[PDB]
């Protein structure tokens, strides 16, 4: 067993969407066994404002900025879609 290999190889909760596209990470980071992990460059993400996060529900009502992770920053690509939690 290789603790370094496994460290960031755990699944993470994603946000869902109403339009059939790939599930995306909120931001570019996730938690695995007490480690803060960084999504790989290219990973699909949502770039939400502080207030969008606070008011994000299980209900589709937030218009969510799609992005691409680059060096741990969710770089917006201009696409919007309705995203929600599970």
């Amino acid at each position: 067993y290789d603790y370094e290999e496994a460290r960031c190889a755990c699944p993470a909760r994603h946000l869902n969407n109403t339009n059939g596209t790939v599930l995306k990470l909120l931001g570019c980071h996730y938690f695995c066994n007490g480690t803060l992990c960084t999504a790989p460059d290219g990973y699909p993400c949502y770039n939400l404002t502080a207030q969008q996060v606070r008011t994000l529900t299980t209900y589709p009502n937030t218009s969510c900025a799609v992005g691409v992770c680059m060096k741990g920053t969710c770089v917006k690509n201009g696409t919007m879609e309705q995203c929600f939690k599970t």
Binding site: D2, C10, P11, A12, H14, P44
Partner: protein
């Protein structure tokens, strides 16, 4: 199925350590998730030969989420 893998564990997980598995294929990075006796979830590549060998083993159960 809201939980998806972002990185693969690139080595062969010792089979002794594995309790069961789950599938997380409908994701940006499709994966087989093995769950260990220490209740760690390990993302793996469905294309690796050892991963397909483990999941076809009748003694290794599919875990409900």
């Amino acid at each position: 199925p809201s939980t998806c893998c972002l990185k693969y564990y690139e080595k062969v997980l010792p089979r002794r350590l594995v309790v069961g598995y789950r599938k997380a294929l409908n994701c940006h990075l499709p994966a087989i998730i093995f769950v260990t006796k220490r209740n760690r979830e390990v993302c793996t590549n469905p294309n690796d030969d050892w991963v397909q060998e483990y999941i076809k083993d009748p003694n290794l159960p599919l875990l409900p989420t």
